[PDB]
């Protein structure tokens, strides 16, 4: 790897600089380099890794959706034939997106997940696995689409099982996992009732535990609870 000659600490320092400069591709490359050193990640380092790739793939997803919409419009009745260019460019963006997802999944599989023994770390990594299979599923149209969807489901479910046993209902990682798995149900698995039920139960169980929290923890938990509420409002 091009980052093999750089110190782990320098890669982390530069990831933080890249974040400040909104250079998320660089941030992701630095964090990949840091993961490939082979040492486990701290909480802060997990956050850096996730922020970097979320921002890179988020931009790719937004671009893919623009192109896919243009392509769909081209295939309607009355639309003039404009040749293969829209499909080609949508495929180009799609292939790059898939590459990023495969890169993240590769880091998780070699070897972040297997070395993660604490509940927070294991849940966080399994959530990420679900997320990146979900992004693959968004663009899947072939023989493997069912298996990609099931890979996302399985990762989210394992994370959910750990989270419920090991973390309080207000824990931000538990909350974020539930938020994202609920979106998986609604958008990917064609299970809107499951999505709504999960968001509602997660919200309600968190509400009942807020009394245990400091002011700072309350702020963290309630921010994600509001995201659950926002989705419920969109869906009901």
């Amino acid at each position: 790897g091009a980052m093999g000659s750089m110190e782990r600490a320098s890669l982390i320092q530069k990831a933080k600089l890249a974040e400040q400069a909104e250079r998320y591709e660089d941030m992701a490359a630095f964090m990949k380099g840091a993961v490939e050193k082979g040492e486990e990640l701290s909480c802060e380092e997990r956050n850096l890794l996730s922020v970097a790739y979320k921002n890179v793939v988020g931009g790719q997803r937004a671009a893919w959706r623009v192109l896919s919409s243009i392509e769909q419009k081209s295939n309607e009745e009355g639309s003039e034939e404009k040749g293969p260019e829209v499909r080609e460019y949508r495929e180009k963006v799609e292939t790059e997106l898939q590459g990023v997802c495969d890169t993240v999944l590769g880091l998780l599989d070699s070897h972040l997940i297997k070395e993660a023994g604490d509940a927070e770390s294991r849940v966080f990594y399994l959530k990420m696995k679900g997320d990146y299979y979900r992004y693959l599923a968004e663009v899947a149209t072939g023989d493997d689409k069912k298996r990609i969807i099931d890979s996302a489901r399985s990762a989210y479910q394992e994370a959910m099982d750990i989270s419920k046993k090991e973390m309080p209902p207000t824990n931000p990682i538990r909350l974020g996992l539930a938020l994202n798995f609920s979106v998986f149900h609604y958008e990917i698995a064609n299970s809107p009732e499951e999505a709504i039920s999960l968001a509602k139960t997660t919200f309600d169980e968190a509400m009942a535990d807020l009394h245990t929290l400091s002011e700072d923890s309350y702020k963290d938990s309630t921010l994600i609870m509001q995201l659950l509420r926002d989705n419920l409002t969109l869906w009901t």
Binding site: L179, E187, L227
Partner: peptide, 5 residues
Amino acid sequence: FPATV
């Protein structure tokens, strides 16, 4: 799109 984190 719905919120994710």
